[PDB]
């Protein structure tokens, strides 16, 4: 990891059961939408993606309203649609973690 | 303001000098990772900080950032979503 | 708070109900010992002190086994008993506590 | 290794040069203001330990991410003593700024 730090920590509940899929060689890719709100109620939705082991467990133990802790990195990946688009996500890979609260 | 923790910590370098329009500086940083692959963040500072960055942050500048993620919805010339790291309430920025 | 970043993030459980105490002018001080463990087990205990509002709430809502999220700073303070140091996670400025 | 999250993030400067014994002990200072500086006892192992010994000198500014660990030791008077430190192990990390 040259250059600075890139890290996000989230604590929220999934607004929907874990969308588990399996990419080609090595099926293991889970997608969760984490919700975190605040007052002073303004809520924000998060697109997280878990891999390998974290994916599976996500799939086996995580369900809609579940609350979880997430430590991941911020990544924005572009893609041209059936019509250029960009989507930034919180990916959990290397020094990352996911956990049931 | 409970129910969940929205927090991103960043340390890295600016791509271009601070684009301050109006008490709001928009800064885009870079964070490399190797095993190359750089990643670019859209950080947005307000009030006090906005001005400090404007006055002390130049292109190369290395900084520490702590804010929250916010995805905002806008329609363009012809729907679009832009997620950025906003240093608001309990956030903070500093020169390294 | 220029120069450096002092910040710890904890998620764990309270080992025992919050020991709330009221300081001189403006009583609001809570003391919680947080437990975080690691298997692969090996646990580690943390002293956490809350203040004002967060203190009150802890008192009211937290109990023994409850699980929390803590964000604060590290402060080791010296005191000679009857020379010693005690390091703790203190929730002051940009800190926070949350029941999970 | 669940049940709770033990994590401290630090950015700051070394008091002395790295005291290497693969294990580097460094101490870090983070000041606050409203002065009042605070001193951290950081411990690096293996790979990082050596890097620190090789590139970190007194003034060096570094980013640290580790876990808190309080160690219980006895001490010549045969009295119990406790020392908490920031240990950069598993998912930890250190970097020069």
Swiss-Prot record, chain C:
A GO-annotated cellular component: nucleoid
Coiled coil feature spans: none
Residues in SSB domain copies: 5-98
Keywords: DNA damage, DNA recombination, DNA repair, DNA replication, DNA-binding
Alphabetized GO MF terms: single-stranded DNA binding
DNA-binding segment(s): 45-51
Any one GO BP annotation for this protein: DNA repair
Record's subunit section: Homotetramer.
Function summary: Plays an important role in DNA replication, recombination and repair. Binds to ssDNA and to an array of partner proteins to recruit them to their sites of action during DNA metabolism.
Designated name of the protein: Single-stranded DNA-binding protein
Organism in which the protein naturally occurs: Escherichia coli O157:H7
Residues of the full protein shown: 2 to 113 of 178
From Swiss-Prot, chain D:
Domain SSB: 5-95
Organism: Escherichia coli O157:H7
One Gene Ontology cellular component annotation held by this UniProt entry: nucleoid
Keyword Zinc found: no
Phylogenetic placement of the source organism: Bacteria, Pseudomonadati, Pseudomonadota, Gammaproteobacteria, Enterobacterales
Entry function: Plays an important role in DNA replication, recombination and repair. Binds to ssDNA and to an array of partner proteins to recruit them to their sites of action during DNA metabolism.
Record's subunit section: Homotetramer.
Keyword line: DNA damage, DNA recombination, DNA repair, DNA replication, DNA-binding
DNA-binding residue intervals: 39-45
Residues of the whole record sequence present: 2 to 113 of 178
Annotated protein name in UniProt: Single-stranded DNA-binding protein
Gene symbol of the encoding locus: ssb
Gene Ontology biological process: DNA recombination; DNA repair; DNA replication
Keyword flag RNA-binding: no
One of the record's GO molecular function terms: single-stranded DNA binding
